[PDB]
Amino acid sequence: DALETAARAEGLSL
Amino acid sequence: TSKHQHPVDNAGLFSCMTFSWLSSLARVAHKKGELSMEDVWSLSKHESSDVNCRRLERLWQEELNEVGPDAASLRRVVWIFCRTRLILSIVCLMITQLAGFSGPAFMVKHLLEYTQATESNLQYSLLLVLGLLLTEIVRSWSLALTWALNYRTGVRLRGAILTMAFKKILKLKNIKEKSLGELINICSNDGQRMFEAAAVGSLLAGGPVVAILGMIYNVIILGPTGFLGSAVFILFYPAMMFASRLTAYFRRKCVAATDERVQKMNEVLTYIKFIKMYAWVKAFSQSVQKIREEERRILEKAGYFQSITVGVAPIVVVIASVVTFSVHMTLGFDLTAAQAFTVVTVFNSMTFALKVTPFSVKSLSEASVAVDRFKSLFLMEEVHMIKNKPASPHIKIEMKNATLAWDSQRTLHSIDLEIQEGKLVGICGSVGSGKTSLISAILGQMTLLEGSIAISGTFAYVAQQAWILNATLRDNILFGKEYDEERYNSVLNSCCLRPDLAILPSSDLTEIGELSGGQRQRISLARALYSDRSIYILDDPLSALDAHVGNHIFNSAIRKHLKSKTVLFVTHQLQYLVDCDEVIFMKEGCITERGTHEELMNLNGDYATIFNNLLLSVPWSVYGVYIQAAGGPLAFLVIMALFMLNVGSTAFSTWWLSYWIKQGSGNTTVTRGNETSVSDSMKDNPHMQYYASIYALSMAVMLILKAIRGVVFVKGTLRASSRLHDELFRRILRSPMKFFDTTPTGRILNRFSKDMDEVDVRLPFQAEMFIQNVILVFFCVGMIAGVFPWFLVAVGPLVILFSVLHIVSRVLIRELKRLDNITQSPFLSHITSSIQGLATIHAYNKGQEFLHRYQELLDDNQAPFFLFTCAMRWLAVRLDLISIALITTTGLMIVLMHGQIPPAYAGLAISYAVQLTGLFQFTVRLASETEARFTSVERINHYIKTLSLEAPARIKNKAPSPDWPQEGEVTFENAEMRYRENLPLVLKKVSFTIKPKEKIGIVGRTGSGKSSLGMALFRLVELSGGCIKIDGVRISDIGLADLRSKLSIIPQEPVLFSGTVRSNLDPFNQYTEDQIWDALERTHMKECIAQLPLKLESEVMENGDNFSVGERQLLCIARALLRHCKILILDEATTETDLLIQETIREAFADCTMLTIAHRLHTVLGSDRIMVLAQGQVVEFDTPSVLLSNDSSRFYAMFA
């Protein structure tokens, strides 16, 4: 999801 | 992995904030460009797996003793385990939100109020800008601290839970209760799930408070009218969750669609040659095309929804602003610029928070599912051990009147056994009698019901499956014991491992994959012999082993080596018990006959009855080719124009707000009492309705432009992808067979299977997100520059620094990910190896070494992953600091020119500058993902471009004749044919002629050229010399379809395609139904077809594995006979069913020319002529009757 990848792209794995 | 102390323990608060340790590491990486396992730090003692395991097991035991093993909740256990860290994280996050709310709103309000004032007081505005910089920096640092604490806590929790779960599975009773795949998955991704849980939940506890604070601030600023602006998120976010659910549903559809498509692709490529000489390409081409169009429709729907749900945040804030301000202005309320821009900035704040929260909610749900699964895998039965010592050490095994029932069933009843040391005891019985049950019960996997079992000394076990350790030959033979030379050599020579040593050049030092069954059995026996335990149990060691070598091994090992220790013999062969010291017969779980062998035949029991039974980076070329496949530069220009129009229209709405506020009274003379004067009030302008109408038009433009852009982009991307698919299919179906002869089908299948779905479901997504992010950032910067160019010349060097940071971070991230994968792979390999043979490990009591090895693997696997996560956080901190510098400089620039610009312009500038925050690491990550996807598409492009082209299906030679072939006469003349270049020639000067209506049989040794004639006659591989004449017409002067349509063969193996009987017989439907029925009755198939209500619509699966073999052969030969080709060849078509097939073939094609490629002499007996091939040449040519009558004839040699 667009919102799901928002938090992951901050500092987590994709 | 060589260090004294981790930098964490020796790092201060400032270093913890700026990650100076990883800064030095990244500088070293940039200096070198490559990383190694030695350059990284080892795990500190704080996060060691063993200590965390001890803490977790202690807490779990306490909870179990507290509530009991009936309502135990691991949620409470992990809560106590991480409580202190969680409270620290939530306090720090509360500080983050308080700062990021109090700073921007209050500073912006005060700055705009001062700007609206007339007098100049620099002493106040400088204080304000210093304050706002302080709040921004404090919020950034507090967020960094929160994330660092969350990372450490997550690492600790993941390590502890993984090692405890491994201990639990190593202490398991049965392995067949649950699937092996899920048991591997419970130790593969659950650590990532726990990491997500901890970190992103601690982040989840930060959204509602700032949302509520924003609502309160908005209402207190505006009035009772702030509810309209605060209700937009409530009315909207259900739409986002609805869109997410719909996208998930459509994805669930297209995954099944593409599964069907890839199954069809595998089916068609499995028999590519079989299609190749039939010229049936168009049928499967069209089938693939329609499946592709169905999946393309599903992808279109999914893409519409995805592009709908991409970039709502500026849209959400714009909608909130327009609705709130239209309502406020229409109802006669007054307003100023400062309130407006404070409102929009606060709105940006809650948009940030509410964009953070939802994936955290999803991660929490996944965590709940995972911990429930763990609780399920925490409450099974534990394998017990029987430690009751016997009365005397002489009686190593003792057991008295014990009965058992297999857990899932009473099997064994009233058993009385006693075996002394040094005595060899054999076990006799049938399958299912209880041999396996009794040895398993002795192994300790069975409970104790009656009496007691006495077990003393170690145990030696050899497996029926012969479990092989995932290591080299020299490793698993020692099995944790010290190395010896003479003992190892004697053991190896005892089990005849010398052929195994000689066959493999590096046999002594070759890793064994997770070989032959005999080799596994013999290495198992060698391992057992080297183990040198106390009690040696043994089951069927010569079942898969050859009789002679097995007997030699038994004589040289059991009768020589283990003559002084207790040995238990179990085997399905009763011929080895003649020399055994004692024989035990096992029957129906109860002992019936026992004693010495001679007495065992003397008693003439049921043993004698069965005893006699056996006696009788990527360049711009990839980007250019992808753009060209998209439809040329015009589509690129259109999509860029659409994105620019969307962002420019958002700019238009905001600038219209600014213009509305700036217009003021418009020089309107109004009365305010007893006197009249010009009052700069919004409500006095007689044209506010026009402005409201322009607002409505702006909102409509918002919605329409977003929808149009999304639809157009999705359609363009899918058109490009489908064009690439069609091109690749067209090229691959016109490819040589040498492609498949040289390259395995796995690579091509993977290119069709995973790369295609990867590009289709990933590249548009990341590409669109990256384009939107970059265009939004560029447009905001362009606005701020259009207000102040000095800002632009200030941010230039900042752009350069951002590029440098991006390069460094990309290098470090790639290196860290490579190290993580390279340390992850052997981890999974070891888990698989351990779970494969758990019973043997339990039998040998080697559990501690395995858990120690797994702890080592977990440590050196989780070190680089933790470093990688910290590096990403460090990059985020640096980019946030750059944005803070930007906000400080734009605030100072706004201050410096007080009184010369209208307040609305300053407010819009500061609002956009605030919006600029937190929009850089997103760009970097999206760039990395896009370049990875373009690397994949580059691989696909190289794969498609490196192909070749065959001869065209149509040639200038034209059709030979409408009635071609006129006869069945073929003459060969010096056939020279070779499989490949530089390959030895398979055909060497062979010339022969075949008269029509004759049966010809080709018999020869393997590789003599029997198979080559099929390709030679079909022009499949170009002739290297000589000519082939059929009816006086050279084969090379006929088009591919022209002669491929008049030739048919029958392969060795039946070939049945997925689909229906009608499709599997004639997809083109060029035959009438009565002809099909006549063919079926000739083949004797109507009796097996008519009774089915789907007689001509009977579904056929992959390879048609639902009929009998006779039915398959009959339908295949029907698929040969309906074509009524003049020339037909069989290739080794292979009791009553076989005879029926042969007689059907004999009666079927009696009126054509038969060529037979048969390896069986008996079937070809009585043929008209026999073809003999001597390594690619013919030596005899006559009737077989005169050939079998000649002893010197080669044809008569193998007959005897």
Numbering used by the authors:
A (entry chain B): 48 to 61
B (entry chain A): 94 to 501, 575 to 680, 685 to 786, 840 to 1357, 1362 to 1427
Wording from the paper:
To uncover the mechanism of hMRP5, we determine six distinct cryo-EM structures, revealing an autoinhibitory N-terminal peptide that must dissociate to permit subsequent substrate recruitment. From a clinical oncology perspective, hMRP5 can directly contribute to cancer drug resistance through the efflux of many anticancer drugs, such as methotrexate, cisplatin, purine analogs, pyrimidine analogs, doxorubicin, and antifolates from cells.
To determine whether the peptide-derived EM density is from the R motif, we generated hMRP5-ΔR by removing the R motif and determined its structure by the single particle reconstruction. hMRP5-ΔR displayed a relatively low ATPase activity and adopted a similar conformation to wt-hMRP5, with a peptide still trapped in the binding pocket. These results suggested that the R motif does not affect the organization of the TMDs and NBDs, and is not the source of the peptide EM density in the hMRP5 cavity.
